[PDB]
């Protein structure tokens, strides 16, 4: 999320939760294999459907309702 150091010298940052068996997008440095980095974590369609309480199928976000 964010990481840095204060003028005093003390280090601050975050440790976002890490999960096994999750799908992660990867971008190689200079398009070299054997140079991986994780960009973000994307869940499955079922998992996303389970963890949302929105009953609307669709509709423009600008509608009041």
């Amino acid at each position: 999320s964010f990481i840095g150091r204060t003028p005093e010298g003390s280090v601050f940052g975050t440790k976002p939760l890490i999960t096994e068996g999750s799908v992660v997008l990867i971008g190689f440095l200079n398009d070299d294999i054997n140079s991986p980095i994780i960009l973000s974590v994307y869940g499955d369609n079922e998992q996303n459907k389970m963890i949302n309480t929105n009953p609307l199928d669709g509709g423009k976000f600008d509608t009041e309702s």
């Binding site: 440095l29 200079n30 070299d32 054997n34 140079s35 991986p36």
Partner: protein, 64 residues
């Protein structure tokens, strides 16, 4: 050994197609300068770089 007595035709000469000044052997490309230990350690001659300045030659070696 081979003497001139077996030579039918020859086409041999100098060339400046390959020319580099700095040579280095980076380690396997996962290791990267902003997140770990020493990245690279090149070598150059001071007289050589006058004609061809900062001409680099890089090779990744999977082994190191």
């Amino acid at each position: 050994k081979v003497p001139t007595e077996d030579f039918i035709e020859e086409d041999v000469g100098k060339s400046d197609v390959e020319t580099y000044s700095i040579f280095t052997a980076t380690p396997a490309g996962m290791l990267k300068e902003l997140n770990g230990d020493v990245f690279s350690k090149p070598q150059f001659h001071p007289e050589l770089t006058d004609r061809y300045g900062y001409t680099k030659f890089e090779v990744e070696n999977i082994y190191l």
